[PDB]
Amino acid sequence: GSSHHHHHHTDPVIAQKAPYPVTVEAGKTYHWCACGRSKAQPFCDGSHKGTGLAPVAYTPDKAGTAYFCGCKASKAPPLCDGTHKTL
Ligand code: FES
Ligand code: FES
Numbered sequence: 001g002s003s004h005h006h007h008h009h010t011d012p013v014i015a016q017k018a019p020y021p022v023t024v025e026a027g028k029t030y031h032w033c034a035c036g037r038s039k040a041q042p043f044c045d046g047s048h049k050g051t052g053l054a055p056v057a058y059t060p061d062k063a064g065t066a067y068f069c070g071c072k073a074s075k076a077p078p079l080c081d082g083t084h085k086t087l
Contacts, residue, residue, distance in 0.1 A: 010052050012072035015041045017087060019067035019080035026062045031055040032069070032078030042068035042078070 001011060013036035020042035024030060030043060034056055037047035044055035056078045060066060069077060071084035 009050075012036045012053060014071045014073075014087070016070040017084040018070050019084070020070050021065050021067050024060045024064060024066045026060060029057050029059045030066075030068075030078075032058055034072060034077060036072045042070060 001008070007013070012034060015033070015036045015038075022030075022042065032042055032055055033040075033044045033048070035048040035051050035053035037051070038045040039047065048054060058066070058068075058078050067080040069080045069084070071087050073083045073087050074081045075083055
């Protein structure tokens, strides 16, 4: 939401204004927390229940480091696209 006045209970919250780097395995599906509520960031732990928000599945083609979005405002979820810098 562009509006800055209020947090609505269905809005994502920032976990941190910085990515969560994670070494990922090729072909394994990761479930990114889109809501900011998970206690196991950057991954969903079911805490989204009650907000209407939902995790995003991410299956990398190859092994490497994925910089998952921590601020929850990336325009290219689930990965950091730098939006945290201006959020
Ligand atoms: S805990 Fe945040 S999307 Fe599931
Ligand atoms: S942590 Fe969200 S865009 Fe970088």
